[PDB]
Every structure is written in C-alpha cells, then in structure tokens.
Design a protein around this ligand. Structure first.
Ligand code: NA
Ligand code: NA
Lengths: 369, 369
C-alpha cells in the first residue's frame, strides 16, 4: 500500500475534538503522547498558505499537561529544567528544556506558573509524567502529580486576534505573548494562553470544562466565517522554515541543549540545581562537536519518513538530515540536520542520496526566514 | 471519514523490519513506544485464523528494552515493581507490574535477568526509561540506564515450536516457557525467549545484531513454507479471547493491580522494597471498588475507539467497556470492561447503546477460551 491506515484503540486516545475534525476533513493523523493529533487537512502547502493569511482552529489535545502541585512543586519543576525559574511569575509561560542525568533532552515543554504551589508542564512527545513521579519519589518530594483533564484547542494565524476579540472582548487583546489569564465563555472561565506551535500568532485554550470547550470550538467556527476560519494543525513547512524544533523529530534523548541551539535557556551561573548541571558546564567549556543546522537541497520534492546521512566531498558521513520538506518560498527542499563541526559553516556543501541519485545540498543558518 | 492515513516522520520510529513488512502486505499501523507497530496485514479475522493454525513472524521492535546495569541495578529494578525478584534466576523472564506512588500501574513489562548486574525490562506502551532515570537520580544509584539497540522479532502460533527446531535444532525445544538462552544463527548468537503477545505458543528473538536478525527474518520465511509461515502482528481477536490485557487499553495509570487481576504478582508480605507498597497494603484490605471482567454483547460487529459506558436496566453507569471485537468463535462481540463492585457477578445483564439499537449483554469470567 502507499498509505497505511492508523489503527484506533482506547490506547491511541481520541480527543474531545475528534468527531468534529473528522467531519471537517482531517486526512492524516500522527500520534503524540499516546493520543491522536491531526497531521493534514489535505494539501500541506495550501494549509500553510491559509495559516499565514487567515485563522485556524486546531485540535492539539495531545499536548498533554503534567500537573505538579503541593509544597515541593516549584522545586521539582526547577530540578527537571536547565532554565532558571527563580524569578518566575503567576500568569506567565516559560519554554523550559527538560534534561536527564547526562544533560540530554527528555522533552521541550512550556511551563505555566498558575500559583507558587501549582504548575502545568505543557509537554512535547514523551512521558514527562513518569520522569516527575520517578524524581519525586527518589528525591522524597511532597507533591501531587497528575495528568489533569485538559485538552488544548489552538487559534492560530494573523486573524486569530480579531477572532478572539470578537469572542472574548478587548480584555484578551491585552494578553502579552506567553501570558495567560482566565476568560469567560457563556458562564465558564477558561484558561487561555497566548502561545501555540506557529509563528503566525494566536492562542491556546486550555480546556478543562470539556463540554464548554466543545461549544466554544463550534462557536469559533460559526462567528469565524467572515475571517475565513478553517480547521488545521501544526504545519510541517512552517515548523521547518521557522525552526520550531520538536522533541523526537529534530532532537532526542542522545542530544543536549547545546547541540539544539538552546544555549539561552541553560542557566549555568545561577545557584539553582537542576539535573546534569555539572555535565552541561563541561559541554559548554569543550563546546559541542555537532549542532542542528538548516540545509537546502535543489530538488522540488522529498518525503522524509526518517533519518538520512549527508556526506562530504570524499563520501564520509558529515551529518544526519532529520526533517525536510518542499518550501514554496525557496522553491526547493529545506531541512533540519544534525551536522558535524567539520561542516557547520553556512554555505558548506554536501551530498545526499535521494532514491539512487546523489544530489547536492548546502548548509545554512536557522531559522530560514 | 472512516479510515485515516498515518503520517510518517522520524519521531514515529521505523524498525529493522519496516522495508520487509511493507513488501509483505501490512495495511495498518499503531504507534507503541514512539515506534511503528503493525496493526493489520489485511483482514483481522483471517490473520487470526492463520495465527491459530500455523506460524507467523512478527515485527515487535516497538516492545522496547530499558537496560539497567551496574552495582545498584538489581535494587532499582526491584524498586519499580511489586513482583518479588529476590529469588530471580539468570535465564528467566518475569512479569513485573511497575507501580507508582499511588499503587497504580505505570507499565506491565517482562523483566529478563541477564546478570545479577544487568537487566532488560521489555516494556508496554509507556516511557519506563524516564521513571527509572527519575528514581536513579534521587537515590543516586550507581547504574547505567539506556534503551539498547534491541528490536524484537516474534515467532508465534502452534507451528512456532517446529519452525524454530528446524532452524536451531533440538536445544531450542528444551527452552521452557518464560525462559531465555543464546542460540547460534550463521555464527551470530541471539538471545531468544519463549514468550510473546499471543497464547498460541512461540518465541521472541531479542535482536541486537540487526543485520543478522534481518537475515534470520528472511530465512524463517524461506524454511517456514512447510508450516505455511506468514507475516503478522498482535491480533486483537486472539488477544481478547485469551484475556491478554494491554496497558493503555484495559488498564491505565488510574488503575491498581488488585483491579486488573494481578493479585498473584503483588508481593506484600516479603521484605522487598518497592513504591506504593504501603498504598497497596491499604488497598488490598479495603478491597477493589471495581475490577476487570469479561462481557459478551449480542451484535455481530463493533469499532471500539475509546471507553464506552455500560448501563443497568435504568440508565445508571455500572461499568466501562475498554476493549472489544467480534469473536468468530462466539459468532458475537466480546470485550473487557472495568465493572463496579455492584455488578461484578458472573452473568449480570446490562445494556449498551450502539447507534440506533439498545443491546443486551452480560458480565462473564476471564478468559473466554
Ligand atoms: Na491532539
Ligand atoms: Na514494532
């Protein structure tokens, strides 16, 4: 077969939005945190153009929460991340790389500080819940760790702001990037952050009252018509062009923050203690020997289902291409590659096998645009 | 809206068998431990008839390993599970439920004791690696925790015994259920366990030397024609008929081993140290307020994608149906349901809404065959 069906089960969890997106034209799924996440609503290029010009509503329920509350919650949260959260404030979001005893990445979540003793970790694709529960028991912390009933719906694109003002009023227009607050929809208060996995702008509604959230979803489609609202999902071309890097895809647990361009979130000269702090000091001293870079390959098509070695002018492996797509902006293929320090340099050339043909490519900086 | 395509990417990992099984008729996939696991090779009823009569070779690489080695490995392994490993032997497998701070199920793996100081945890669908790494950090255990390069290939069905004899000779026929040993294929030694996710008989080859395991895979298809060998995967009908439970489907992290029939595997009155031991002492005295049970329901067809409430005569919720299929053996739908204390009783009637018809069903004991 060219395509394989996804086999549904209780274990591969549906969302509060599933029956709706399946009537609105979802054509492919990925799995993220043991949950269905839409991967396409037809053409990925057309979804990208629509996202950059209009507004979309996304089922991103699979961006699960780990809720950590109780006396040692602030501390357990800070143990897990190399980002300094000592001056953190209620109502703010912070991108906090989670790292292990080796200094290697576990997850790149957004942390929401709801209160001094209550923390939501909005996670990428790995079971941070169990890392937390492991660390809590091992370090003897007094916390409560749950996956709460929270199912995110995103509102993304340049028309997101006008659409959400229409629904929630002028108060939501005051929300700064990566702030959150509580907003009323027909009696129910919903936590809404100004965040989301694009650079086109918008919001994420952290739906706890599921029924009210489903009615809100339906309402956004009804009063969004004048804005050309439509369904969507995180967009492959957008995430590569803007270097919105994802755990499991661009980097994984054999990679450290310094190989992924996360230098500014690794806070080594505080007195806060987090995992692998010592090992990350050594890495920052000797410097990394490999790093995520962009690449361009002058072909009009690619379908990356997995990794692919890239080779030098002698046919020695100089890196690994990890994500890639056709970019209409460049009218060629662009990607994210973990490349050896020998070939880091913006403009450095390389060779890669696409089918049975060597083809040339070149390294570039991230983001692409 | 009926079947949906899966979107492949690096993050949904492929396996050493992917290119082979996509030439042998795989039609559907699930995702298991962030990895492709075949869900169908065409009709589920026909794969089922074939498994029960003949022999199949399965890609089950998604049954990943957590390898824990070093001086504190035995202790860390035991800390994660309720099952008593104090008398454990090299060359044996053990079903070892992993339990958290609430006494609830994290994963239900098989543990393989390779050495006093080297352990493989063969995992269900959750990231046990990070629970282990969390525990190890707190207790400052002297251990190394990695996911090794191990990609299980299974041989299952009544003809598995004879096919493996053909390849490996008499010594494989000596291997007892849940034992493992090392067996020579073309000069390479492979760890092979007598185990796997059917009740139809067979083996799991824990392939570390991938190129040799790929050659072995192709060899099995050649010298297995005598036994009508074919491709396959864990079979939904077979596994419900045999009451083989799965983490995420029948039970999850809100469930404790006393609710799932894991009583024989919980060691409360030994001296072993493990998480939630006290909670499980509490829980076992009070007793389970709900348990897993069999159900049989009078329709010839179902598509379970999620929990489905089952009701008494007067529309009260007595349970939740979690796995279900049409059983060609019963010529009707059977399933596994988590049922309230009030309605446990073997033969209790109930009703379930499936589209435009209310359907009679009743509770029964496990297994079915
Ligand atoms: Na989702
Ligand atoms: Na697999």
């Amino acid at each position: 077969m060219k395509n394989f069906s996804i086999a549904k089960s209780r274990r591969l969890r549906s969302t509060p939005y599933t029956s709706r997106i399946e009537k609105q034209g979802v054509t492919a799924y990925t799995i993220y945190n043991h949950m269905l996440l839409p991967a396409a609503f037809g053409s990925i290029e057309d979804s990208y153009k629509h996202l950059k010009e209009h507004v979309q509503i996304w089922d991103v329920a699979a961006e699960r929460q780990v809720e950590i509350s109780g006396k040692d919650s602030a501390e357990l949260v800070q143990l897990m991340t190399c980002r300094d959260l000592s001056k953190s404030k209620i109502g703010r979001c912070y991108y906090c790389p989670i790292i292990d005893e080796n200094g290697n990445l576990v997850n790149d979540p957004v942390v929401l500080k709801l209160d001094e003793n209550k923390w939501w970790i909005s996670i990428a694709d790995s079971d941070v819940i169990f890392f937390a529960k492991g660390l809590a028991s091992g370090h003897k912390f007094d916390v409560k760790i749950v996956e709460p009933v929270v199912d995110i719906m995103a509102i993304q694109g340049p028309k997101s702001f006008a659409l959400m003002e229409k629904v929630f009023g002028k108060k939501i227009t005051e929300l700064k990037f990566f702030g959150f607050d509580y907003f009323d929809f027909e009696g129910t208060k919903h936590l809404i952050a100004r965040s989301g996995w694009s650079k086109q702008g918008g919001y994420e509604v952290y739906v706890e009252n599921t029924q009210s959230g489903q009615k809100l979803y339906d309402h956004l489609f009804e009063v969004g018509k004048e804005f050309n609202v439509g369904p969507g999902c995180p967009n492959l071309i957008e995430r590569i062009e803007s270097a919105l890097l994802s755990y499991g895809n661009d980097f994984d647990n054999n990679d450290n923050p310094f190989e992924c361009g996360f230098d500014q979130y690794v806070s080594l000269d505080s007195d806060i203690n987090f995992l692998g702090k010592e090992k990350l000091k050594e890495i920052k001293l000797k410097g990394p020997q490999k790093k995520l870079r962009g690449v361009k390959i002058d072909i009009k098509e690619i379908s990356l289902t997995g990794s692919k070695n890239i080779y030098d002018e002698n046919n020695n492996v100089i890196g690994e291409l990890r994500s890639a797509c056709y970019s209409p902006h460049f009218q060629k293929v662009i990607g994210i590659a973990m490349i050896k320090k020998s070939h880091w340099e913006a403009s450095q050339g390389f060779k890669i096998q696409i089918n049975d043909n060597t083809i040339n490519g070149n390294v570039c900086d991230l983001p692409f645009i």
